Swiss-Prot record, chain B:
Keyword match Hydrolase: yes
Purpose of the protein: Catalyzes the hydrolytic defluorination of fluoroacetate to produce glycolate. Has lower activity towards chloroacetate and bromoacetate.
Full protein name: Fluoroacetate dehalogenase
Residue numbers binding fluoroacetate: 108, 111, 152-153, 216
Amino acid sequence: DLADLFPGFGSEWINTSSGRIFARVGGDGPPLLLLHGFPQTHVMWHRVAPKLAERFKVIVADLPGYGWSDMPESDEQHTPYTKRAMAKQLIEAMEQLGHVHFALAGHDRGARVSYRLALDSPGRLSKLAVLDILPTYEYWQRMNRAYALKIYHWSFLAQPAPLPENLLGGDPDFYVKAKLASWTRAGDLSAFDPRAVEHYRIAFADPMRRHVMCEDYRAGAYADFEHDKIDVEAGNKIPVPMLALWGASGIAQSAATPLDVWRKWASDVQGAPIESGHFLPEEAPDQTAEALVRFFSA
Amino acid sequence: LADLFPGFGSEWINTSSGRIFARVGGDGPPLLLLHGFPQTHVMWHRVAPKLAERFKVIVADLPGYGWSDMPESDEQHTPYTKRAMAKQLIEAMEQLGHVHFALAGHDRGARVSYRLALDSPGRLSKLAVLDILPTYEYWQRMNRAYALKIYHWSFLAQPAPLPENLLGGDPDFYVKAKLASWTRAGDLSAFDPRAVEHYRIAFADPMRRHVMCEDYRAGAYADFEHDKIDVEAGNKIPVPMLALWGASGIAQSAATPLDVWRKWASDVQGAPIESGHFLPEEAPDQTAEALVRFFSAA
């Protein structure tokens, strides 16, 4: 019994060669794909997608393996949950809608899908927005005591199965709520819509879903990092005009500005802090929506 | 629970910070053996008998571990800082009349030991640390590879009750996962099954698990801070010390251990042992011979 947090939006099951993508679709105008991250689902956009739906066809997609999207069978390399493979799957999903050139905003894992998409297939993107991430390579290259403690879950969830799966099963409700709360500015669940939290909680209550999320982070520690590394060493930069938003108290933020990081990764990047923790579209939807609307409006 | 030290006495030693449980046997110069995580004093059951031919062997449960009392922690995890555990073990040895003693530590117990040797070198005749580098060095070398190898350093250091809640769902799984994963063989075959029972039973207690996390929280914070002060002040252990490490243990990853220990100790000798992390259980002969040789010399 989950709430419909996108009234007026349609519900689409988009067939891909790797399984269905679930999407809420609303609005008209240029296509804009919105990708959620961990440990959420598409419903994390529920406060900003209506604002975007004023000017765009907004596709609010569950990542491969997340939410109501099918979970592709993983392999030893976690291939389907590498950002390269998710980007390819979402490109195929977007093609099923006849969208071969689209705007993309991603948050957290979905933002990693999104910059990887921009690196692999920049022709697919009109403009890219990434919310509160640095490239996965940068997290791993900056790995030190302080970051290891802050994003312990990057190493914890990347442990070989079934260690994180089994530990996550010890208190999945506590864990997903602890993640949501601890990454907000508030430090509790008060920034979230209780109906959205229920979406996240139900998704996280499913051990197969939790395993996918670990596959995602295992990809994030290995193949995703390797893919990123190849780009850094080749000097490959995202040519897609890009917006990098981050929470003043979000994950990506540190002394050195996330914009300065992305400038090494993107030829055309503007950025701005949002007074927010990690969950920009829910902790600060008005500031987030306006930033995206302003950046994507063309 | 099996008696793994036949002929060893049992002592509950009062300290200001709770009772320290220890098996005591042998005769000769006092030698304190300290276990680590997720073990208890019984991990010495294969080497202490040989040690007890030459030494008065005191096989203690760390403060908070095994059958030692669990001082209530605080927000700084003070009693489970290695500094505090060392002071409590000094007290305990004082109760027995041992103001100057030999000390062999493994894992967390080796962290207590080198901290003891930095804080109160006059208390130590000689020091052996088994399969560790200083906590500072683990954190200073916490790159992507090492963050994945010892993810638990950052996972168990997460604020309570996060790791405690995950560990509580299936504690047997985690303690066995840890014992297995750090051995050469990657399973539990190196361990006396009766010893595993001791470890599993200790780990079954939620308060014991909490202490373990407190240990790791101190490890991520106060312990690191205390180490940082000493390295950045150039303080070196002046106690003749033996560093043993497993060729397949934790210490050997991230750094060549003798090179690291030479920065920390003015009189250090080193020997790898073909073993995983659990030198005295995976390589009891080689470990006991190295310890006897080292402690019987000067």
